[PDB]
Amino acid sequence: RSPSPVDPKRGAVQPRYFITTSLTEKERNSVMEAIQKLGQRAVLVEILPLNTTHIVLRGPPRSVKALCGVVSSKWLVQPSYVFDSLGAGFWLDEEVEGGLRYFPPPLRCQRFLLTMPEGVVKTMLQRVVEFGGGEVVGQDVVVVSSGDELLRFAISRD
């Protein structure tokens, strides 16, 4: 988060399709109202809607939707990205605002060995791996014992 206070860097003038994840109802409604107020080709719109480009979340990626965004090259931005852009009068540059985007998709065509017992956590991680174009092994493998390990792998590629 480092825009210039004089001439803050403008983001590209193009459609932005926002969803939110794991926000409180109050913060979600505030984010929605700000997106609608700023406009300028942004819209608040499967695990992710097929038209998703941006995911608003508070804090680091933790939910299934946030992890699917990490591995499918969506922008992951804090609520401040929306409120700061409304304050500037235009959509700010996502990277200057501290937004996260991992390109190309970091799990694509990679094989993952989930060294954990069966359960909802394993199931969710298999869904994330597949959402990112990877394969879960049922040798060139990435061993994962936690979602944190998969996340740290996904953000450290290229």
CATH number at residue 91: 3.40.50.10190
Task: Name every residue whose Cβ is closer than 8 Å to that of residue 6 and which is 6 or more positions away in sequence.
Answer: none
Rounded Cα gap, residues 72 and 65, in angstroms: 10
Q: Are 131 and 112 in contact (CB under 8 A)?
A: no
Q: Are 24 and 68 in contact (CB under 8 A)?
A: no
Phi, psi (deg, nearest 5) at residue 143:
-85, 130
| Amino acid at site 145 | S
Phi, psi (deg, nearest 5) at residue 10:
-85, 140
- Burial code (b: 16+ CB inside 10 Å, e: under 16) for 54-76 equals bbbbeeebeebbbbbbbbbebbb
31-39 — which CB contacts under 8 Å span 24+ positions? 31/56, 31/79, 31/82, 31/83, 34/82, 34/83, 34/85, 34/86, 35/82, 37/86, 38/82, 38/85, 38/86, 38/89, 38/90, 38/91
Task: Name every residue whose Cβ is closer than 8 Å to that of residue 114 and which is 6 or more positions away in sequence.
Answer: 122, 125, 126, 136, 137, 144, 145
Instruction: State both tokens at 99.
Output: 């937004």
- Burial code (b: 16+ CB inside 10 Å, e: under 16) for 117-154 equals eeeeebebbbebbebbebebeeeeebebeebebbbebb
Other beta carbons within 10 Å of 28: 16
Going through 21-110 in order, the beta strands assigned E by DSSP cover 42-44, 54-56, 75-77
What range does the domain containing 42 cover? 16-101
Rounded Cα gap, residues 73 and 100, in angstroms: 9
Beta bridge partners of 44: 18
Q: Are 36 and 17 in contact (CB under 8 A)?
A: no
Rounded Cα gap, residues 119 and 108, in angstroms: 24
Rounded Cα gap, residues 34 and 47, in angstroms: 24
Q: Are 135 and 127 in contact (CB under 8 A)?
A: no
Experimental method: X-ray
CA-based nearest residue to 138, from 117, 119, 112, 156:
112
